[PDB]
Amino acid sequence: NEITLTIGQQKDLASMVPAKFAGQELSWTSSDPETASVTDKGIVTALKFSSGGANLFLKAPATGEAIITVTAGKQSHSVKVITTVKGKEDIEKLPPLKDHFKDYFLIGNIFNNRDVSGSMMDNDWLAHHYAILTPENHMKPSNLTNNRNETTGEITYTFSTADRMVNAAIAEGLKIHGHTLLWHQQIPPWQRSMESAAKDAALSVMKKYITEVMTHYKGKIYSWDVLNEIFPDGRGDNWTTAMRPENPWFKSIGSDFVYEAYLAARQADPNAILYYNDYNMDQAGKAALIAAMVRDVNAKYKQAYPRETRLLIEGIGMQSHHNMDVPASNIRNTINRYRELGVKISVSELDILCMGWSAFRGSTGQGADKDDMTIATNRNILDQAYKFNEYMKLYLENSDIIERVSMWGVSDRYSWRSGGLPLLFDADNKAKPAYYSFVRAREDYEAAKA
Known part of the structure; x- marks a missing residue:
């Protein structure tokens, strides 16, 4: 009873x-x-x-x-x-997340090779809940190319795993966020070696890589992150000098490569919204650096193609890998900063650790299948759920410029930061308090608007 x-x-x-x-x-x-x-x-x-709730969630819920x-x-x-x-309720037993928020922004998530059988989606929760999917892994450079021919210049692509993934999602009516063309990690040795090349040679190789990848996927990709995580921090005063030297395109071409990359991409697939994607944008320093780069590249694009309507870098994905120590006010400030740019915004990789960064790093550290080692307490989990609600209301308040809120996974078990229980669903694919709070932000937001 x-x-x-x-x-x-x-x-x-x-x-x-x-x-x-x-x-x-x-x-x-x-x-x-x-x-x-x-x-x-x-x-x-x-x-x-x-x-309880000083008590460890894993010991005594x-x-x-x-x-x-x-x-x-x-x-x-x-x-x-x-x-x-x-958690009690199974993910599949809940109404679509995308439907609840459809008047505000696309609700996204990520997927993997694992999620597709042949050319079709191998589980129903992804299409059930989400309107757009980012491939977690299989569009990273190392997964898209494994060689370059030194004599001809011919780049060797491995498209087939990603093609199956794209075509599967599309068959179910889902969009795709492409991720990512230019990065300082998870790149093939032929791209790393580009760090030693000449500016003019590198420029042509970089433009070629971008063009060829986007041409293969032409018309199928809603948005692309052309360039990922280019600032090490927010210390730098000057974006042209502040960028990661471990990025092989930066080291070889210098700061011009940014403008040239996005321009190659626009010419390759105009249908695609071009994004820049980074984490710790809640840190005003780093956000300053990013807004400056985006301002200058888009000014350059304007000087170059004065009749052109569109922006060159059309969007700024805020990865939004957050944790207990991140205030909504800092996020809101950054959004105000990017609002001055005229760009679209995405919450591209949202998750929230149930603790502070150090506690996460001190306990499990990174990687999946670590949820059953979490030191999170019961209070932590309700604190997480409040934070999802507070952030979402802020995104709802900014939903004129925010076209997408995507989270960096479905279940905590398969989270890249699983030790921090960072997502809406638990290890059994059941709804956490965070799920409910997440959904509730719409009810709360509209309750304020009347």
Whole structure:
């Protein structure tokens, strides 16, 4: 005669109404309305737990309980509701995330070779919930090319795994965010060696790589991150000198390569929105560097092609790999900074560690399948859920310029930072409090707008 609900979850109790209460006037109360609240129509929401939460989530998930009572006439009936940090509802049993937010922005996520069988999607939750997918791995440079011919210049591509992934997503009506053409890591040895090349040679090779990749995928890719993570930090005063020397395009061509890259890309696939993508954009220093680069390249593009409507770098993906120490105010400041650019914005890689960066680094460190080692407490998990809600409301408030909110994974188990329980779904593909809070930001936002 009892039910268990994840905190944030709401449940219609009408089905547990006794048969002999039919046709009557129902009245609903909770013994502990702060723990679980119930509407006059009998919808109960799990709100909080009773006790733990200094306690490790993995040892002793925190709980609470309220007795909720339906009364008709002089008779009543009671159901014990158990509230819990632990996930209950299966991902596939929830209404599409993309539908809830469709009037605001695309709801994205990532996928992998694993997710496709042949040319078709091998699980239903990806298309069910998300409108756009970023390949987590298989479009990185090292996965797209394995050689360059030294005599002819011919670049050797491996497109087939990514092609299958793209074509699978498209068949289900899903868009694709391409990721990424130019990077300082996870690149083939032939690209690393470009760090030793001449400016004029490198420029032609770089332009060629970009052109050829985008031509292969022409018309199929909603947006591309042309260039990824080019600033080491926000210390630098001057973007032209601040860029990563370990990026082989930077070292060989100098700072001009940025403008030339995006220009090659635009000529290759005009259908594609061109993005620059980076993390720690909540750090105003780094964000200053980025806004400056984007301003100068787009000014250059204007000077070069004065009749052109479009921006060259059309969007700024904020990776949004956040954690307990990241304030919404810092994010909001950065968004105000990028709003001055006229660019589109994406939350490109959103996840939130249930702790501070050091605690994550000090406990599990990075990599997947580490969720069952997390030191996160029960309070941490509710704190995470509040943060998803606070960030999302901010994105909703900026949804005129934000076209996309994508998260860097589905289940915590398969998260690149799994040790930090950073996502909406748990290791069993069940909805966390964060899922509910995530969804609820729309209800909260609109409740403020009326």
